[PDB]
A and B are shown apart, each in its own frame.
With several copies, the nearest count.
Chain A
Amino acid sequence: DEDSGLLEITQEKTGSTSLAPSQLIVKYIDQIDGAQRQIIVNNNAVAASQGRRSSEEIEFLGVPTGELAGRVGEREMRLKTTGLKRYKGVFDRRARSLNPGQPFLIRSTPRGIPETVVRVGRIEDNFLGDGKITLTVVQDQFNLPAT
């Protein structure tokens, strides 16, 4: 927090939702026969929003089964169409022990940002000299469904 170890938060990157796909094509290889196979992950709501159809192709040749490919494709669609908010905060020494991928909470009442869960990204810190510890974080929207 501002009084708990946060110096200044500059970037917000609220993003947009009218853009981003409405249909996702996942291509995988079946190890039983080694033949190319694909599955389709659909986005009906954003498709209705989109006046023009859009689609992208992602290759996951490491996936040996269709269900696993579907799970990872759902995760990718979740990430790509949920509208992540990317913050670039400035912290004091209180954020010294953080490591990449470590989630933590940030609160700043003046900015109108409630308690939000974010995951650490790029890290740049200056222990000696300027004393500036600056972190780049992203909203927590990563999860691999089991079904």
Chain B
Amino acid sequence: PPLGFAALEERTWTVSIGTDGPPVVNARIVWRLQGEPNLVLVITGNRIIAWTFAPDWGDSIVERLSASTNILQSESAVTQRRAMRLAPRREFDANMYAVDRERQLLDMTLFGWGARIWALPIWPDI
């Protein structure tokens, strides 16, 4: 960090962002110098791991669209509808295989990352 800046010199560092870290990026890097108020460079974001396994499709892949709509009807056959979810929740069901170097990677991937946000590719949209 200690770095002398020549006059009329711009020093552009290479901020390399790795792929390993907490799922929530809450960083506050402080550039503190004498005779100058602290100039903190705040880096914010999230870390995610993408699902990179191609699932076998001999059995059809099932996509489920679900929404909530609680409806109450009176004694007469009249219904009032109160659709709750504007964006239906999407669920995907599929089967897959892993033999040569994908089985161990899958085991480690579901071991370390476990239950956390993925980046699921849309297989039907290949």
- A: which residues have CB within 8 A of B? 2-3, 6-8, 92-93, 108, 110, 128-132
Name B70's closest neighbour in chain A (CB-CB): A131
Binary interface profile of B, 74-86, with partner A (CB < 8 Å = 1, else 0)? 1110101010100
A131's partner among B74, B75, B76, B82 (CB-CB below 8 A) is B82
Q: Which residues of A contact B75 (CB under 8 A)?
A: 2, 6-8, 108, 110
Q: Which of B25-81 contact A (CB under 8 A)?
A: 70, 72-76, 78, 80
Q: Which residues of B contact A129 (CB under 8 A)?
A: 70
- B: which residues have CB within 8 A of A? 70, 72-76, 78, 80, 82, 84
B70 touches A130 (CB 8 A): yes
Q: Which residues of A contact B73 (CB under 8 A)?
A: 7
A3 touches B74 (CB 8 A): yes
Name B84's closest neighbour in chain A (CB-CB): A128
Jot down 24 A-B pairs with beta carbons below 8 A, ordered by A.
Answer: A2-B74, A2-B75, A2-B76, A2-B78, A3-B74, A3-B78, A6-B74, A7-B73, A7-B74, A7-B75, A8-B74, A8-B75, A92-B74, A92-B80, A93-B80, A108-B75, A110-B75, A128-B84, A129-B70, A130-B70, A131-B70, A131-B72, A131-B82, A132-B72
A92 touches B70 (CB 8 A): no
Name A132's closest neighbour in chain B (CB-CB): B72
Q: How far is the CB of A84 from chain B (nearest CB, A)?
A: 24
Name B82's closest neighbour in chain A (CB-CB): A131
B72 touches A3 (CB 8 A): no
Q: How far is the CB of A54 from chain B (nearest CB, A)?
A: 40
Q: Which residues of A contact B72 (CB under 8 A)?
A: 7, 92, 131-132
Q: Which 7 A-B pairs have the closest CB atoms?
A: A2-B76, A2-B74, A7-B74, A131-B82, A131-B70, A2-B75, A92-B80
Knowing that A2-B78, A7-B74, A130-B70 touch, tell me 14 more A-B residue pairs with CB under 8 angstroms: A2-B74, A3-B74, A3-B78, A6-B74, A7-B72, A7-B73, A7-B75, A8-B74, A8-B75, A92-B72, A108-B75, A128-B84, A129-B70, A132-B72
Q: Which residues of B contact A132 (CB under 8 A)?
A: 72
Q: Which residues of B contact A92 (CB under 8 A)?
A: 72, 74, 80
Q: Which residues of B contact A108 (CB under 8 A)?
A: 75
